[PDB]
């Protein structure tokens, strides 16, 4: 499955995608070279690709802090919208 992470329509248009139960090597192979079910590929470039237990997280900067869950993701990961922003 493919799920979209957003902090709100107008809080920001910035969003992150999750390929739950996927390895962070096929989504790079899911670049615009081969057109998978998703059509957009601008974020497929990455530069912030993060691999987690739940799957592959793209477009979301990875930090090394601890906070209360904002948006559940899975396998001990929650993402929020903080600062730069």
């Amino acid at each position: 499955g493919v799920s979209v992470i957003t902090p709100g329509t107008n809080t920001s248009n910035q969003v992150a995608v999750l390929y739950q139960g996927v390895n962070c090597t096929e989504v790079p192979v899911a670049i615009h070279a081969d057109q998978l079910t998703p059509t957009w590929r601008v974020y497929s470039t990455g530069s912030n690709v993060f691999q987690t237990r739940a799957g592959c997280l793209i477009g979301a900067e990875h930090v090394n802090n601890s906070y209360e869950c904002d948006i559940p993701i899975g396998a001990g990961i929650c993402a929020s919208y903080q600062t730069s922003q």
Partner: protein
């Protein structure tokens, strides 16, 4: 809440039920038995 390092509980004993740091999974002794007893399937690991 973190348990105090000194286990002075008036003779009452909880070492087995309290976590032991040595365990890679910080689980009490009894908890480990429960994990082994359950023949879990479809763990959902990332695998590869």
């Amino acid at each position: 809440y973190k348990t105090p390092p000194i286990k002075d509980f008036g003779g009452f004993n909880f070492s087995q039920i309290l976590p032991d740091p040595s365990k890679p999974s910080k689980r009490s002794f009894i908890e480990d038995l429960l994990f082994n007893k359950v023949t879990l399937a479809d763990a959902g690991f990332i695998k590869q």
